Design a protein around this ligand. Sequence first.
Ligand SMILES: Nc1ncnc2c1ncn2[C@@H]1O[C@H](COP(=O)(O)OP(=O)(O)O)[C@@H](O)[C@H]1O
Lengths: 165, 171, 369
Amino acid sequence: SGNKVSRQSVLCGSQNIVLNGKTIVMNDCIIRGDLANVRVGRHCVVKSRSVIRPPFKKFSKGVAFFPLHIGDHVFIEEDCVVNAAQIGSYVHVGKNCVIGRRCVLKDCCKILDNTVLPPETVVPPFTVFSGCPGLFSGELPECTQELMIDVTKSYYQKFLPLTQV
Amino acid sequence: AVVCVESEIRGDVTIGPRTVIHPKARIIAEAGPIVIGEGNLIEEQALIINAHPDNITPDAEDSEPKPMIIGTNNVFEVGCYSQAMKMGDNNVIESKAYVGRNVILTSGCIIGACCNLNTFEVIPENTVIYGADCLRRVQTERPQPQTLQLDFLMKILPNYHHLKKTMKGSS
Amino acid sequence: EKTAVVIDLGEAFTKCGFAGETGPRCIIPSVIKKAGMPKPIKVVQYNINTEELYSYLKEFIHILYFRHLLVNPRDRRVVVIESVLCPSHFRETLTRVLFKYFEVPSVLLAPSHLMALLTLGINSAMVLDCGYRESLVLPIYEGIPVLNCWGALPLGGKALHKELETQLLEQCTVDTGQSLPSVMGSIPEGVLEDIKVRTCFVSDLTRGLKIQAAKFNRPSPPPNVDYPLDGEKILHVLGSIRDSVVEILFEQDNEEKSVATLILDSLMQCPIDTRKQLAENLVIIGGTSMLPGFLHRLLAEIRYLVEKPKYKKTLGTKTFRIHTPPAKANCVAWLGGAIFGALQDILGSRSVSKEYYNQTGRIPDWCSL
Ligand SMILES: Nc1ncnc2c1ncn2[C@@H]1O[C@H](COP(=O)(O)OP(=O)(O)O)[C@@H](O)[C@H]1O
C-alpha cells in the first residue's frame, strides 16, 4: 500500500508483514514472518537496517514466547532489536535499542534510543521507557504522540519513494 | 545437523551433530578449523570468526596453528558474533553479544545483550553478566554451570529441538 | 486525620515519607539530576544564585512529592527535618516555594538531634551526628538543646573521599584496558561510596596503633579484596588503606583537633549537672557512624581519651552509657520526624503558618522580633 517497496528489500521468511498504508517500506532489515506473526498497522514509519524477527509461537506446553505485538502509526527508528515484546500503536521507538524479555508496551509508549529491558518487562500507555534494564524515562504527551504519528506517516510517504525500486 | 543452504560457512569446519545452523548464518572457519558442538542452534545474522588476520597485525610471533572449538547446548543467538569463542557445555550467547577473542567460555555462560566479551579473560563457570553492568559476576550460584543455568539452557533447547525438526521439515 | 510530610535532609541525602512512616520509602540524595546536564547537579551550594535554586526547588520538590508521596501535600502539613548552619535565606527560599509556590498548609523546621531525642523518648542527651561532609555534636539539657556547648566541624566522609582519591593516586593497580596509577582523571564518589559500603570494614584500636606504626616505623593488611571496575580496570586495595582513612579521624598533633576533642570540650563547658547527665545521656547519630567495627573501636578510643591529662581530673570517672538507635542511625532522624508528625497535630501552632508568611513575606529566625 503506502509503504513504497524499497529497491534492496530482503528478509528471511517474512510471510507476516502487512502492506501498511501511508508507510515507507525500508530496506537493509530482516523479517522472520514465516516463523510467527507480527502486529503491523498502517500509517507507521519504519527505518532501515533494523533487526526484526518473531520471538516464538508459544513453543512450550502452555504458552511460551508469543509471536510479537505492535501497533499502527508508530514512529520506529533504526537498528533496534525486537525479541519477546508487546508494543502498542503510535509509539515513538528508539534507535539501536533492544526489546526486553517478555516486554509489553501499550499505545503511544515512547522508547529511548539504545535502551533495553530486563526479563518480564512492561510499559503503560504513552509512557516513556529507558535504561539498559527495565526502566521508565517518563511519559509521552498524547498530543505529541498523535503529532509524531502524523508526521511519521507524512515523512514516510515523502521519503518512501526515494529510489525504492 | 541442519546444514542450511543459506548458512554461509567458510573453510574447513568439521562440525558436530545437532548443530542446526539457521538461515543467513554467515561464518568463517578457514584460518582456524572451528569444530561445532552437540546440541546448539546457530541462528541468523551470526558471525563465526577464525584467526584474526594481519589487519590488526599480531606482531607477537604469529605461529598460531590452533583451531577453534564448540560445546554442547551452547546456542548463540542473532546479532552476536563469534570471535573464536572456546565454549563448553551450555554457553548461550544472546542478542548482539560482541564476542571477544580469548574468552574461554565455560559452562553456565549467559552472554547478555551488548556485553562485549573480555579479551584474554578466562571465562569461569556459573557466571551470568549484567547488561549495562559489564563484567557483572552476579548470580554466582543461580546461574550455576550445571543443574541451574545449564538446566535452563536445556529447557530453552526444547524449543530449539522443536524448531530443529520444524526447520528440517520447512527448509 | 492527615499524615504530615516527614522529609529527611542533609549534605548527602534527602529522604521522606508519611507521618509515622516506619520504613525507607525511598532515598534521594541532596542533588538534582538536571535534564540535559550529564551529572546530577547538587543542591548543597553556597554563595550561589538562589533563583536557579528556586527553579531546582520547584521542579525537584514537585517530582519529590511524586516520588515519596505520589500525591499533593496541600492537605497535610510538612515536617521539614532541618539542621542548623544552613543559610536561613536559602531556607526562606524553600519556604517561598512551599507557601508562595505550592501553597502547602504549614511547615516547621526542626534539627536532627531533636528528632533523635524524640526517638529515644528521653530529655537530656549528648548526641553527635556523623554528617556527610561534616561532624555535628549537639548536647541537650533535659529537652533543652544546649547552645554554647555543641559540635560542628568539617569532619565528614567528604574529606575522607578526598583522602580516598589520594589513595587512588597512591594505590592503583588498575589493569591494562597493569598498574595505571590514576591515569583516568575523575572518580565517581557515589560509586566510591557504594564501594565503601561493600568494602570499608573498620579495624581495632590496637590496629589503630598499628596504623600509627604505619605512619612511622605495615601490620595486617588483610582482610582485603581487590576492586574490578568494568572496562578491564581491576585494582587491589589493602584493608590497612581504608582503615588508615578511618584512623586519621583523630590527628591531634600540635593542633589537638579531633572528634573526641570536640565532644570532651563541649562537655567541658557544661556545668556539674550536665556533666554526669551527658555522661549517661549519651547517644550518637549520623549515617557515617554506621561502620563495621568503628563504633566500638571508636568508643574504646573515647574511653581512652578520657585518660587525657586534662580529662581525668575534670571529667574522668563518668559512666558513658550510650543509647542505641532502634533502626539505621541515619534513618532514625527521619524516624524521629515521623514520630513528631505522627501524633502531634496539636503542635500546628508551633508550625510556621502560611498566613504569617503571606502577611509577612519573611520569618524572623532566632534573632530579635
Ligand atoms: N550505613 C552507612 N554506613 C556508612 N555511612 C553511611 C551509612 N548510611 C549513610 N551513611 C553516610 O552518612 C551520612 C549521613 O547521611 P545524611 O543524613 O544524608 O548526612 P548529611 O546530613 O550530612 O547529608 C551520609 O554521608 C551517608 O552517605
